[PDB]
Amino acid sequence: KPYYDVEFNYRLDPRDGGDEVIWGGTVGLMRRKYETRTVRINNERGNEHNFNLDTHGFAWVKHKTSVTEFADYLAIRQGPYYGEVAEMLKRVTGATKVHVIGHLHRSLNYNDTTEEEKNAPDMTMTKGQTPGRFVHVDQSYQGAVRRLYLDLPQEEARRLEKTRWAIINVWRPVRKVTNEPLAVCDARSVREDELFNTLHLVPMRWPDAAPQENQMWAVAPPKTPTQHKWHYVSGMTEDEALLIKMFDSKKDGTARRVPHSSFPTPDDFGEPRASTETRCFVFWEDQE
């Protein structure tokens, strides 16, 4: 198909009932209220070469990994995957150094999971992760700084912040994507006044620990299915990677942040889409 027209979940203003806390990995997040809008998502399979991290903030690349089982977090983090992702990412970006923070594995079907968790209290944590069905950027400009100093040593963070740096997510499906693909929005089609800093909390080890803290962009709804420029690539395989730019320190016109969201297509079929998204810092110690 050349495109789809699908309902997307955008920011609901608090004056109209919305809240400002994204309770990551909870049943409650699946119940969050959004301003829904229908947008056009252009299929770009066969046109991937036309999109890059500098202009649009995303790129589809061919990249073979040696890892096949992505469900075991410990197996992934000790194994070679992070280094494989980091070498690809430096190759693509021309970066000077790449530091992999971690990854999130997603394997649940959204609607299946809604109904199994219909009786669950909101703060119940799902075993596994559902797709990310809301428009967001994983880090605000503030959230990117917060992440840099939380995930890197203090001296390291201070120095790398003097040179150009960026947060890029490396999204790879476990197998050929036949349902709930991932859509990315042209960074240039959304303005700064549409971006809203939003708290993102992960209540790991409650009540012994405070929930983990992160700051996202929420996105104001468009007024037109084509105002925001949405794209995706059908049938993404585990030998292909979607690089999504969440943040870039460069303030000179280069794509700085990419709203993104999964979405169901009417032709969805098969067992639930499964994927990993690997959060990465990217440093160009020769710039800025």
Ligand X SMILES: COc1c(C[C@@H](C)O)c2c3c(C[C@@H](C)O)c(OC)c(=O)c4c(O)cc(OC)c(c5c(O)cc(O)c(c1=O)c52)c43
Chain positions contacting ligand X, by CB under 6 A: 24-25, 101-104, 132, 138, 147, 202, 204, 212, 214, 279
For ligand X, the nearest residue by Cβ is 24
Which of the choices Cu ion, ligand X, ligand OGA, none does residue 102 contact, using the CB cut-off of 5 to 8 A by kind?
ligand X
Work out which of 84, 117, 138, 248 binds Cu ion, going by CB under 5 A. Answer: 138
Sign for the CA dihedral angle at 145, 30, 231, 5 comes to negative
Q: Which does 11 bind (CB under 5 to 8 A by kind): ligand OGA, ligand X, Cu ion, none?
A: none
Token digits of residue 228: 């925001």
Residue 275's binding partner among ligand X, Cu ion, ligand OGA, none (Cβ under 5 to 8 angstroms by kind) is ligand OGA
- Report d(CA 37, CA 23) in Å as an integer: 22
> Alpha-carbon dihedral of residues 36, 42, 43, 46, nearest 10 degrees?
-160
State how far the Cα of 67 lies from the Cα of 95, in Å rounded to an integer.
24
Structure tokens at 178: 């036949």
Q: Is 171 in the site for ligand OGA (CB under 6 A)?
A: yes
Name which of residues 87 to 126 contact ligand OGA (CB under 6 A): 106
By CB under 6 A, residue 257 contacts ligand OGA: no
Beta strands in 161-267, from DSSP E residues, in sequence order: 164-173, 182-185, 195-202, 212-219, 230-232, 240-248, 260-262
Query: Which residue's CB is nearer to ligand X, number 5 or number 71?
Result: 71
Looking at residue 92, its amino acid is V
Q: Compose the 84-123 pattern: x for residues touching Cu ion by CB under 5 A, - for all others.
A: ----------------------------------------
For 111-174, the DSSP string reads: HHHHHHTTTS-TTPBPSS-----S-EES--HHHHHHHHHHHS-HHHHHHHTTSEEEEEEEEEES
Binds 106: which of ligand X, Cu ion, ligand OGA, none (CB < 5-8 Å by kind): ligand OGA
**Which residues are near Cu ion by CB under 5 A?**
138
**Which residues are near ligand OGA by CB under 6 A?**
106, 131-132, 138, 169, 171, 182, 260, 262, 275, 277
